[PDB]
Enzyme design. Structure first.
Site, PDB file in Angstrom:
ATOM      1  N   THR A 134       0.875  -1.162   0.000  1.00  0.00           N
ATOM      2  CA  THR A 134       0.000   0.000   0.000  1.00  0.00           C
ATOM      3  C   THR A 134       0.920   1.222   0.000  1.00  0.00           C
ATOM      4  O   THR A 134       1.910   1.204   0.730  1.00  0.00           O
ATOM      5  CB  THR A 134      -0.916   0.002   1.232  1.00  0.00           C
ATOM      6  OG1 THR A 134      -1.776   1.129   1.208  1.00  0.00           O
ATOM      7  CG2 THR A 134      -0.085   0.116   2.481  1.00  0.00           C
ATOM      8  N   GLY A 135       0.619   2.221  -0.823  1.00  0.00           N
ATOM      9  CA  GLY A 135       1.453   3.422  -0.959  1.00  0.00           C
ATOM     10  C   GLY A 135       0.575   4.653  -0.973  1.00  0.00           C
ATOM     11  O   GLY A 135      -0.504   4.620  -0.427  1.00  0.00           O
ATOM     12  N   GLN A 136       1.048   5.701  -1.639  1.00  0.00           N
ATOM     13  CA  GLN A 136       0.465   7.063  -1.596  1.00  0.00           C
ATOM     14  C   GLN A 136      -0.985   7.086  -2.014  1.00  0.00           C
ATOM     15  O   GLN A 136      -1.805   7.832  -1.446  1.00  0.00           O
ATOM     16  CB  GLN A 136       1.233   7.969  -2.557  1.00  0.00           C
ATOM     17  CG  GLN A 136       0.720   9.414  -2.598  1.00  0.00           C
ATOM     18  CD  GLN A 136       1.407  10.332  -1.612  1.00  0.00           C
ATOM     19  OE1 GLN A 136       2.610  10.610  -1.746  1.00  0.00           O
ATOM     20  NE2 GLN A 136       0.648  10.848  -0.648  1.00  0.00           N
ATOM     21  N   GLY A 144      -2.947   4.203  -2.198  1.00  0.00           N
ATOM     22  CA  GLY A 144      -3.642   3.005  -1.803  1.00  0.00           C
ATOM     23  C   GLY A 144      -2.939   1.706  -2.210  1.00  0.00           C
ATOM     24  O   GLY A 144      -1.688   1.634  -2.338  1.00  0.00           O
ATOM     25  N   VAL A 145      -3.734   0.672  -2.419  1.00  0.00           N
ATOM     26  CA  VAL A 145      -3.183  -0.651  -2.607  1.00  0.00           C
ATOM     27  C   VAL A 145      -2.686  -0.924  -4.017  1.00  0.00           C
ATOM     28  O   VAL A 145      -3.161  -0.343  -4.943  1.00  0.00           O
ATOM     29  CB  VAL A 145      -4.246  -1.709  -2.262  1.00  0.00           C
ATOM     30  CG1 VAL A 145      -4.682  -1.648  -0.774  1.00  0.00           C
ATOM     31  CG2 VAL A 145      -5.481  -1.590  -3.113  1.00  0.00           C
ATOM     32  N   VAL A 146      -1.685  -1.774  -4.079  1.00  0.00           N
ATOM     33  CA  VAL A 146      -1.040  -2.247  -5.260  1.00  0.00           C
ATOM     34  C   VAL A 146      -1.091  -3.750  -5.293  1.00  0.00           C
ATOM     35  O   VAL A 146      -0.813  -4.382  -4.267  1.00  0.00           O
ATOM     36  CB  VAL A 146       0.410  -1.679  -5.443  1.00  0.00           C
ATOM     37  CG1 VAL A 146       0.974  -2.046  -6.790  1.00  0.00           C
ATOM     38  CG2 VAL A 146       0.405  -0.133  -5.268  1.00  0.00           C
ATOM     39  N   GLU A 206       4.907  -1.899 -15.114  1.00  0.00           N
ATOM     40  CA  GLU A 206       5.828  -2.977 -15.007  1.00  0.00           C
ATOM     41  C   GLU A 206       5.853  -3.561 -13.596  1.00  0.00           C
ATOM     42  O   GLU A 206       5.784  -2.846 -12.632  1.00  0.00           O
ATOM     43  CB  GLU A 206       7.191  -2.370 -15.340  1.00  0.00           C
ATOM     44  CG  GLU A 206       8.355  -3.351 -15.291  1.00  0.00           C
ATOM     45  CD  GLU A 206       9.636  -2.731 -15.846  1.00  0.00           C
ATOM     46  OE1 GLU A 206       9.671  -1.523 -16.214  1.00  0.00           O
ATOM     47  OE2 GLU A 206      10.621  -3.482 -15.874  1.00  0.00           O
ATOM     48  N   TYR A 207       5.954  -4.872 -13.490  1.00  0.00           N
ATOM     49  CA  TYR A 207       6.009  -5.582 -12.251  1.00  0.00           C
ATOM     50  C   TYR A 207       7.469  -5.727 -11.755  1.00  0.00           C
ATOM     51  O   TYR A 207       8.310  -6.085 -12.491  1.00  0.00           O
ATOM     52  CB  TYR A 207       5.421  -6.981 -12.439  1.00  0.00           C
ATOM     53  CG  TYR A 207       5.484  -7.867 -11.245  1.00  0.00           C
ATOM     54  CD1 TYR A 207       5.013  -7.465 -10.090  1.00  0.00           C
ATOM     55  CD2 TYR A 207       6.007  -9.148 -11.291  1.00  0.00           C
ATOM     56  CE1 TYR A 207       5.086  -8.239  -8.921  1.00  0.00           C
ATOM     57  CE2 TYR A 207       6.041  -9.961 -10.137  1.00  0.00           C
ATOM     58  CZ  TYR A 207       5.570  -9.506  -9.030  1.00  0.00           C
ATOM     59  OH  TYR A 207       5.569 -10.264  -7.863  1.00  0.00           O
ATOM     60  N   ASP A 258      10.028  13.768  -6.402  1.00  0.00           N
ATOM     61  CA  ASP A 258      10.032  13.130  -5.085  1.00  0.00           C
ATOM     62  C   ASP A 258      10.949  11.929  -5.082  1.00  0.00           C
ATOM     63  O   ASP A 258      10.563  10.814  -4.637  1.00  0.00           O
ATOM     64  CB  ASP A 258       8.630  12.789  -4.607  1.00  0.00           C
ATOM     65  CG  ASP A 258       8.574  12.292  -3.167  1.00  0.00           C
ATOM     66  OD1 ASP A 258       9.465  12.551  -2.401  1.00  0.00           O
ATOM     67  OD2 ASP A 258       7.520  11.617  -2.911  1.00  0.00           O
ATOM     68  N   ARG A 272      12.276   5.051  -1.118  1.00  0.00           N
ATOM     69  CA  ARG A 272      10.936   4.516  -0.992  1.00  0.00           C
ATOM     70  C   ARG A 272      10.233   4.522  -2.393  1.00  0.00           C
ATOM     71  O   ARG A 272       9.237   3.749  -2.495  1.00  0.00           O
ATOM     72  CB  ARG A 272      10.116   5.280   0.047  1.00  0.00           C
ATOM     73  CG  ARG A 272       9.965   6.678  -0.329  1.00  0.00           C
ATOM     74  CD  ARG A 272       9.114   7.551   0.701  1.00  0.00           C
ATOM     75  NE  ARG A 272       9.140   8.967   0.293  1.00  0.00           N
ATOM     76  CZ  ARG A 272      10.170   9.828   0.513  1.00  0.00           C
ATOM     77  NH1 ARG A 272      11.182   9.474   1.269  1.00  0.00           N
ATOM     78  NH2 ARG A 272      10.247  11.051   0.052  1.00  0.00           N
ATOM     79  N   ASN A 273      10.625   5.280  -3.308  1.00  0.00           N
ATOM     80  CA  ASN A 273      10.089   5.461  -4.703  1.00  0.00           C
ATOM     81  C   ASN A 273      10.915   4.755  -5.750  1.00  0.00           C
ATOM     82  O   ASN A 273      10.850   5.156  -6.976  1.00  0.00           O
ATOM     83  CB  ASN A 273       9.873   7.079  -5.056  1.00  0.00           C
ATOM     84  CG  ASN A 273       8.706   7.644  -4.424  1.00  0.00           C
ATOM     85  OD1 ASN A 273       7.733   6.915  -4.053  1.00  0.00           O
ATOM     86  ND2 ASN A 273       8.838   8.875  -4.047  1.00  0.00           N
ATOM     87  N   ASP A 297       7.129   6.102 -10.022  1.00  0.00           N
ATOM     88  CA  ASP A 297       6.243   7.175  -9.546  1.00  0.00           C
ATOM     89  C   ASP A 297       6.737   8.550  -9.886  1.00  0.00           C
ATOM     90  O   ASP A 297       6.386   9.547  -9.223  1.00  0.00           O
ATOM     91  CB  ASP A 297       5.938   7.002  -8.066  1.00  0.00           C
ATOM     92  CG  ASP A 297       4.933   5.844  -7.824  1.00  0.00           C
ATOM     93  OD1 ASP A 297       4.386   5.319  -8.816  1.00  0.00           O
ATOM     94  OD2 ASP A 297       4.756   5.549  -6.632  1.00  0.00           O
TER      95      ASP A 297
HETATM   96  C1  LIG Z   1       9.076   1.102   0.645  1.00  0.00           C
HETATM   97  C2  LIG Z   1       7.815   1.246  -0.010  1.00  0.00           C
HETATM   98  C3  LIG Z   1       6.710   0.343  -0.169  1.00  0.00           C
HETATM   99  O1  LIG Z   1       6.395  -0.395   0.806  1.00  0.00           O
HETATM  100  N1  LIG Z   1       5.946   0.396  -1.268  1.00  0.00           N
HETATM  101  C4  LIG Z   1       4.736  -0.432  -1.421  1.00  0.00           C
HETATM  102  C5  LIG Z   1       3.635   0.457  -2.071  1.00  0.00           C
HETATM  103  C6  LIG Z   1       4.038   0.493  -3.597  1.00  0.00           C
HETATM  104  N2  LIG Z   1       4.664  -0.894  -3.769  1.00  0.00           N
HETATM  105  C7  LIG Z   1       4.892  -1.469  -4.940  1.00  0.00           C
HETATM  106  N3  LIG Z   1       4.535  -0.794  -5.940  1.00  0.00           N
HETATM  107  C8  LIG Z   1       4.761  -1.307  -7.172  1.00  0.00           C
HETATM  108  C9  LIG Z   1       5.340  -2.580  -7.291  1.00  0.00           C
HETATM  109  C10 LIG Z   1       5.582  -3.120  -8.705  1.00  0.00           C
HETATM  110  N4  LIG Z   1       5.571  -2.254  -9.681  1.00  0.00           N
HETATM  111  O2  LIG Z   1       5.738  -4.321  -8.776  1.00  0.00           O
HETATM  112  C11 LIG Z   1       5.639  -3.302  -6.147  1.00  0.00           C
HETATM  113  N5  LIG Z   1       6.205  -4.496  -6.125  1.00  0.00           N
HETATM  114  N6  LIG Z   1       5.370  -2.713  -4.928  1.00  0.00           N
HETATM  115  C12 LIG Z   1       4.994  -1.559  -2.482  1.00  0.00           C
END
Ligand SMILES: CCC(=O)N[C@H]1CCN(c2ncc(C(N)=O)c(N)n2)C1
Length: 271
Positions: free
Chosen positions: A22-24, A26-28, A87-88, A133, A137-138, A151
């Protein structure tokens, strides 16, 4: 097809497989597109984003493509929450990856992470596109250990005012140069400053910058000309690179092209 622009994905083509966090916004989730293609699916919580502005910008972001940039594949707009499809990145956010001591990173691996980000940022800079930003974390990490920038630009669409100016409790004070904290002056050179802090985060295995200070205290420290100091894992040459990102005068900070050259030189000297 009918009913969808080039930037629009049909959400019916998605299969949901796993929660990613979960980020800025919401859920991913992790899923597949058309049964086969791995994707991440960011589900944008109602009220969190300036959606019309973001959608227009997504059209621009569809044309950003670099191996070290998390690719935008499209957006699902017709909807309850809207989705961003990207992209994953199977190993998740960089900050958390750095903090897992089991990896027992070599410093050459840390420098490679810095290079990955610097290549993405040099690409964005060549497009006149600010991250706005940048921070660990990004950044995200794929199954091969490659770090990519994600992001980019999205802070422009965040409606929670605690995030969006220094007067805000969730503003990235610890990643901001003096001219951002004093006057709100964003530029390529505020991305440069943030990149130096990111190199500090990498070499510190994910410590919080200025860990013993509050945000207010951090702003006072930096605006008085004081800085982070050398992580134990950084060589003198690596430290010099990160520190160069923190020149009080924005115009005296390097470009990403220059930073890349400096990183490559150190990789050659330290190899
Ligand atoms: C340190 C920050 C954090 O905990 N971020 C969370 C919210 C965004 N996040 C996320 N976002 C996209 C992908 C992706 N593109 O596969 C992924 N594996 N994980 C995990």
């Amino acid at each position: 097809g009918l009913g969808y622009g080039s930037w629009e994905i049909d959400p019916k083509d998605l299969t949901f497989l796993k929660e990613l966090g979960t980020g800025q916004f919401g859920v991913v989730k992790y899923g597949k597109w058309r049964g086969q293609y791995d994707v991440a699916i960011k589900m944008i919580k109602e009220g969190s984003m300036s959606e019309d502005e973001f959608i227009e910008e997504a059209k621009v972001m569809m044309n950003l493509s670099h191996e070290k940039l998390v690719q935008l594949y499209g957006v699902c707009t017709k909807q309850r929450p809207i989705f961003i499809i990207t992209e994953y990145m199977a190993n998740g956010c960089l900050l958390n990856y750095l903090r897992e001591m089991r990896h027992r990173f070599q410093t050459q691996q840390l420098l490679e992470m810095c290079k990955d980000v610097c290549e993405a940022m040099e690409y964005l800079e060549s497009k006149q596109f600010l991250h706005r930003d940048l921070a660990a974390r990004n950044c995200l990490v794929n199954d091969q250990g490659v770090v990519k920038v994600s992001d980019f630009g999205l802070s422009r669409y965040v409606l929670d005012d605690e995030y969006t100016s220094s007067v805000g409790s969730k503003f990235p004070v610890r990643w901001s140069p003096p001219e951002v904290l004093m006057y709100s002056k964003f530029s390529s050179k505020s991305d440069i400053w943030a990149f130096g802090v990111l190199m500090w985060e990498i070499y510190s295995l994910g410590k919080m910058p200025y860990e013993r200070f509050t945000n207010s205290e951090t702003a006072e420290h930096i605006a008085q000309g004081l800085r982070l100091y050398r992580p134990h894992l950084a060589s003198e040459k690596v430290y010099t690179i990160m520190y160069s990102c923190w020149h009080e005068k924005a115009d005296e900070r390097p470009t990403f092209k220059i930073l890349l050259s400096n990183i490559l030189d150190v990789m050659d000297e330290e190899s």
